[PDB]
Structures are given as structure tokens and as C-alpha cells.
Amino acid sequence: SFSGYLKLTDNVYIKNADIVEEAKKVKPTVVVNAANVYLKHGGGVAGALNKATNNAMQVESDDYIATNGPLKVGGSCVLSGHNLAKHCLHVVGPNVNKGEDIQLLKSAYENFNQHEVLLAPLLSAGIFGADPIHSLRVCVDTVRTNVYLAVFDKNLYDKLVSSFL
Numbered sequence: 395s396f397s398g399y400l401k402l403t404d405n406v407y408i409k410n411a412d413i414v415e416e417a418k419k420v421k422p423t424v425v426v427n428a429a430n431v432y433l434k435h436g437g438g439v440a441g442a443l444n445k446a447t448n449n450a451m452q453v454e455s456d457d458y459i460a461t462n463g464p465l466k467v468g469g470s471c472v473l474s475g476h477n478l479a480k481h482c483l484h485v486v487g488p489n490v491n492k493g494e495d496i497q498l499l500k501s502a503y504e505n506f507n508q509h510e511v512l513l514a515p516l517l518s519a520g521i522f523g524a525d526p527i528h529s530l531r532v533c534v535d536t537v538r539t540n541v542y543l544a545v546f547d548k549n550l551y552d553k554l555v556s557s558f559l
């Protein structure tokens with residue numbers, strides 16, 4: 395069902411795409427959100443996914459946090475995918491702009507292994523401040539399930555592909 399992806403490894407695929415547009419097109423079983431521990435989807439990928447759900451993701455997330463408390467950095471929760479996917483896997487990668495330990499990025503990607511196929515952004519990339527080349531490396535060395543990565547920025551997508559070892 396996923397189209398136009400470049401195959402990086404046996405299980406990792408990448409495309410220059412807006413993950414919101416990609417999710418609406420594919421309606422995957424799982425779309426990954428670049429979440430924070432409070433599930434406050436203000437900006438970056440989370441703000442864009444939440445805005446596509448007309449804020450239903452945020453309303454659901456606030457109820458989740460009221461019941462369960464915050465997630466751990468490196469952790470995740472499965473919530474509804476709303477109009478984007480069957481489910482949304484909210485994964486918290488470390489935020490370098492909050493001084494969080496980059497070593498938690500591998501733990502964050504391990505959450506992907508609980509799902510056979512996922513549409514995902516690069517964890518801790520963008521406003522999370524980590525090097526996206528490093529995020530892609532950790533992704534291919536950690537995720538064993540089938541991951542379709544959507545990279546919004548064309549220039550970053552080209553840099554990721556051209557530098558992939």
C-alpha cells in the first residue's frame with residue numbers, strides 16, 4: 395500500500411512526504427507521533443497530526459494523561475489514529491532542546507518493534523533537536539518491523555539518502 399518509498403534496508407523505507415498527507419492517503423494501521431511526555435501536541439509533527447484530527451487527538455490525549463500521568467522519555471502509548479490511521483503510536487524521543495539524554499533514542503525506537511508495520515517520522519528530529527542522520531541510523535539499527543519513514547523537508551530527505559551507509 396505505501397508508494398514512492400526508497401528502500402534503505404530489508405525493513406526500513408523512506409520518502410519525502412508530509413506525514414499528515416501520507417497518513418490520509420494510506421490510512422495505515424499505525425501512524426507514529428513525535429510526542430512529548432505530556433502528549434501536548436503543540437508543534438512539529440505532533441501539532442500537524444493533531445491539527446489534522448481537528449484537535450480530537452489532543453482531547454483524547456488529555457483524557458489519557460489525566461488517567462495515567464505523563465509518559466516516560468523513550469516510552470509510548472497507543473491511542474486512536476482518528477482520521478489518520480487505525481492507531482497512533484505516540485512515541486517520546488529525547489528532546490535535545492530540553493537537555494534529554496540522546497541515548498534514550500534507541501529506547502524510543504524499540505517501541506516500533508511492537509507493530510509489524512508503521513508510518514513514522516524520524517524520532518527526535520525537527521524541533522526535538524537531534525541530528526536526523528543519527529536518528530535514521532538508530533532507526534535502522536533498532537527497528538526490525540517494517541517502518542515507512544516520512545521526511546517532510548526535501549533538502550533533509552536528500553541529505554539522509556545521500557549520506558546513508
Ligand SMILES: COc1cccc([C@@H]2CCOC[C@@H]2N)c1
Nearest residue numbers: 421422423475476477478479480
Ligand atoms: C483511519 O484509518 C483507519 C481506520 C480503521 C482501519 C484502518 C485500516 C488500517 C490497515 O489498513 C487498512 C485500513 N485502512 C485505518
